[PDB]
């Protein structure tokens, strides 16, 4: 098993970082270009970032659903800024219109200035307490249950979502975060645990922790990894583009941390495929890639790396 | 002027009320049919309801925006269940993707059980206090201000919506409600005051009240009305269709209150229906939000029968 | 087995015949409405008429293909006004973009004024000779053959269509016409034989003729019927609607529930309650008719009316929709 | 006064010529990608090729029209393989559905084997006689006339197209061809005369010739040029990209004829502009100084190069492209 995702640049696109030269603004037309590109090329889905620097994820995901056939949308929900019941009704509606193509990314929100701008004044420990109570109401409501919940942060009485989702029991929950409270939350409620691109040894340390905590609850979770990718026909062109990307550091074999100014895979197709094989051998089944620009690099990655990956990507 | 809206049946559609016979389930395909029908027929916009009994308004409005050209979308926001900054960012994004075709309907939420199901436990006065503080942040945030606000219910620090809306200063605010707090809220913040279908005397009393309260805030508000409509070629067919609607009450000339058994409706021939519309416009009402069962067929019926009797541009479409 | 089609009014739509009152002009928006209506309601396909009084069938069908999911399109080809090779490439392209949703309606062209307006000057016998040679080149080219053909009317040397169709051996061929030469052409080359709405005994006679000729060619052809439909909740409302359709025509039930009023302006129609309409459909189906191409005025509302009133009385999958 | 077109690769796309490696087959999805790219990037229109090696132009242009807003479509008609009345009705329908975005490319058909494959057996002189009679019927039919015409090759009686086009008197006629009979036909009937990418002096001779013949008919025609384009940030990368494009071309199936005018693409099917953005814009400025107002560009791959040309060359071109 392997699910290869791409990325929707709802915060802006371009060729280079740290400059407005060659910048591509977020428009409906260009978002359609990237989304329909990932759709026809055979990517499993697309990840939509969230935050103050982005256009709204739910508006954009809903706008692209009727313009695409098979592509799934990994949409972020932010507990603490919306009612869990309302969030569940939004998820059910979009999952129904998409015929079961919705995936949920649970985002706790790190930036305190951004959280206060949204009206949330919570400590780090309180944010995960809200997410824990949020997901409990959200998951139970989407399964047809009339929820009565009174927790430390959230309180609902007779919460109902009258329109059932297509995916059962609910759209899959993706979650990232390296905190101790985050790993407990992932092991208890989520379906796929996400991590940034770290060296294989450090990733295995994170995975084994979540795997053990989930076993204490009698659960098993799948694993995914997030990686930028600069892949070229030869290794020389790839590193030249990585330098060119940050004009205006190799922490592991072909693992470049320049985008963190998380990390990126830089090299020829065999090198890039070998690092993917190393991550897959650890138990990772989801891969979320990105590249600059997001339109051209979606074709670049599909034409250079897909033939070296397992089916169905080998046949695309 | 005059803006004639239609209605998206996101709570279900059909031929008859109080029965599942002849029901049409809400699907993406059928919502496209109604929306694209209103788009090509020349309706100014379409109203999307909200509530526990509906699919989410924002998902549906966003899905239909890139499938329509001119049609506007009157989407409901519910203060008290979402952060004002986030709601403004949702509004800005949909207004930008739609190229300035977004209209916002401020809905406070009447059902106390439904409000408790969403996590809101507020008295009647408290719901309007939240809406007042919600709108103050929402309006200023969409105007490019980094807002610091600390009220009784809401508090934001450095609230920003980085992507400006297309419509300036922000998408127009439509608002309904007959409470004392509702008329005060409308007179101070909203752009269009909405009312259900009542006899002209009852509407004129409401319109005169808001108009006087808005003058105390140095503003003028436009007025709109929400009305179901059962119009046929002759008056006999219209009343027979009205009777068949509730098989499984005329409180005013051609004003039928049968739909309130599950507001009111205009029933009659085109001249009778057009005459009641002229009466409402003579009171100062410029927006009309109509509906009919089924919403696809009746949208064509109203357009072909009543549009020629309305002012331009509807007379020429 | 049963295929229920609808109709795209590419010549104009409306509520009444013989008047411009309540007319709906052919626009892209209104064509999308009808096509997407038939798509979502579950009709097998939609028939697109041809002629000088219509917009071009190929432009409209190609425009609606990416806007619909399952709906098939019965598009007309006119032998004698286009090269067979070029027509084959058009069919191949539209069938590929549509993922195998193209159906071909072979129209020989009856009106002599319209045929001369297009530059075709052929007698009745010559008209079918051209169609016969056209279909042979068309069918062979779409099967990957480099065709050398030199006939009485058409001549090609090394005719090739490089892009194969999705449907094999080629998009299904529909054909109508009751003449002796038409039945010989249908029994030999086409896939579905079509007929207008006649009384069941009159339909059965044509079907028996084509069925007898096709057995001599070692083939079987399916049969379809073209029928207008005015179905209402009660029989009284249905006949009142039929009267209103032809009210504005200046100076009728030729069979049980078979009304020939639509044959005034430009075949027949089924008028009655849902059980009466479903029974006449069962009679036609008992004769061997497997395709039904229905129409109604207006084409948007009546597509819903027929689906909500008649589909539950038809075989699956229409009974469950 | 400049209209910049792109190209729809309805015959196939890819990264390199002479190889199937990295090839992109013609699909509805990929055609949507290129067409919607040119639409949103601000290209005036897109050219759709014709021939036995292509998918049908009319099906593809009609399929993409309802998926685009401003992009125009330059679609080929081939006289001799379709009735003029039918061809005119097709044009009228597509021009109505597109709200006046249809452009017509008059293609006479050069390949004799391909013409015989379609049933056309005509000499070079006869081919232009058919086109001349075809366009006369086509133009008049689209203007509401019931046309009675009896020529050497075509004959119509009461030819009518009942649905008028949006663009008056008819969708603009584009025409290419360097033959002596071709220049006579262009000077008499068409709106825009097209030429392949030749040195500016050779182009000036063709344009001045057509200009003079059109004055003998009391008309003026606009001029356009067809050019491939390989533009990179620096001149070195552009020539390196040009060399890599024809690396895999077999010598069995077998170059800078002018400053930045490279004839390597003509080894399969004309010429290309190769260089940095300033070099490419300067050669465009030269052709425009001759009187050329339409420019039809293409690049491999056609999706990526549509963005590349718009991001590198549009700012150096006149308005409105300079602000896009």
Residue numbers in the entry:
A (entry chain A): 0 to 247, 282 to 294, 300 to 354
B (entry chain B): 0 to 247, 282 to 295, 300 to 354
C (entry chain C): 0 to 250, 282 to 296, 300 to 354
D (entry chain D): 0 to 253, 282 to 296, 300 to 354
Paper text:
The 2.8-Å resolution crystal structure of unliganded MsuD provides a snapshot of the enzyme prior to FMNH−, MS−, and O2 binding. The two tetramers align with an overall RMSD of 0.34 Å for 1188 cα atoms, indicating their structures are largely identical. Without ligands, the active site lid, the sulfonate-binding loop, and the protein C terminus are disordered. Apart from R225, many of the residues that interact with MS− are observed in alternative conformations or are completely disordered in unliganded MsuD, which supports binding of flavin prior to MS−. Both R296 and S299 are located within the V295-G300 loop connecting η7d and β7c after the lid region, and these residues are completely disordered in unliganded MsuD or are observed in alternate conformations with FMN absent or at partial occupancy.
The monooxygenase MsuD converts methanesulfonate (MS−) to sulfite, completing the sulfur assimilation process during sulfate starvation, but the mechanism of this conversion remains unclear. Termed two-component flavin-dependent monooxygenases, members of this family lack an NAD(P)H-binding site and therefore require a separate reduced NAD(P)H:oxidized flavin mononucleotide (FMN) oxidoreductase to provide the FMNH− cosubstrate. In MsuD, IS-2 and IS-3 are involved in forming the MsuD homodimer, and two homodimers arrange to form a dimer-of-dimers architecture.
